[PDB]
Amino acid sequence: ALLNIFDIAGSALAAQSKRLNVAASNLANADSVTGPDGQPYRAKQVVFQVDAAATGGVKVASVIESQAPEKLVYEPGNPLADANGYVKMPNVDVVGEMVNTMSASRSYQANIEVLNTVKSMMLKTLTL
Amino acid sequence: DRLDAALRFQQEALNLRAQRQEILAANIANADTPGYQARDIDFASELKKVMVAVDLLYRVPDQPSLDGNTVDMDRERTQFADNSLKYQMGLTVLGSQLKGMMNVLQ
Amino acid sequence: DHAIYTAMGAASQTLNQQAVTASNLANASTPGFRAQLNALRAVPVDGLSL
């Protein structure tokens, strides 16, 4: 019942890394006017889940685009503008992404320390 | 030959642990090679087949990467630590069994 | 680990856009000149999962 600790900690590490990647992507594309197809960029974020086969590690279910309405600015001399001359811009909270990165990094560090301690105890168990 | 088989179970377990460790080290070393595919083996089924010439499987990617590199870091690092711990556990079990067999002849 | 590459690419493209704006500002008196617009395009990569 002590080898599941590695699985739980690895799942936590992977979930935190995915959240950090999503935050970095949002920060990078904070000011993306359009994507490949033409639709305006929309902020994305992960949805965690409990990875219980009873409790266990954390698990990322999927990635969803934020339901908050995208911003829109006035620019008639742009082919992307609609009939009213409004071009859509993504709705990204820069402070939100920053604090998400901070929390993800701290949780990453905590999980690393947990894994290190458990590895040390497992290593010392064999000296019975 | 009875001794051969009785120690052979653990000896083959240790050998497969060593092979898996080598593959994990290889995909750690090549972690930044573009166009690389993460490789791994299924320990339980491989051991069953050997007890009753090693095939390897492609690890399922978790995130996309433009340079074509699919070998993650965190998952394989946890795998490396787990494999090292289980290799040490197998080593000490085999050593205990051998010492128990030996001390009877004293 | 690869999350560093998207951020560095964003920084490099920001530097390029700054270069474009500086080039626009440099020739602020050349007769019959047309300014250069600039914009950032998102280029998602479609892998296997997530």
Binding site: - | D42, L57, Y58, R59, V60, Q63 | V43, V45, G47
Partner: peptide
């Protein structure tokens, strides 16, 4: 399947098209 699991055939190539044809 789930990320981090094992599968028989490799992942498809990853591409980043600047503009969809």
């Amino acid at each position: 399947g789930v990320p981090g699991a094992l599968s028989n055939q490799p992942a498809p190539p990853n591409e980043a098209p600047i503009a969809t044809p």
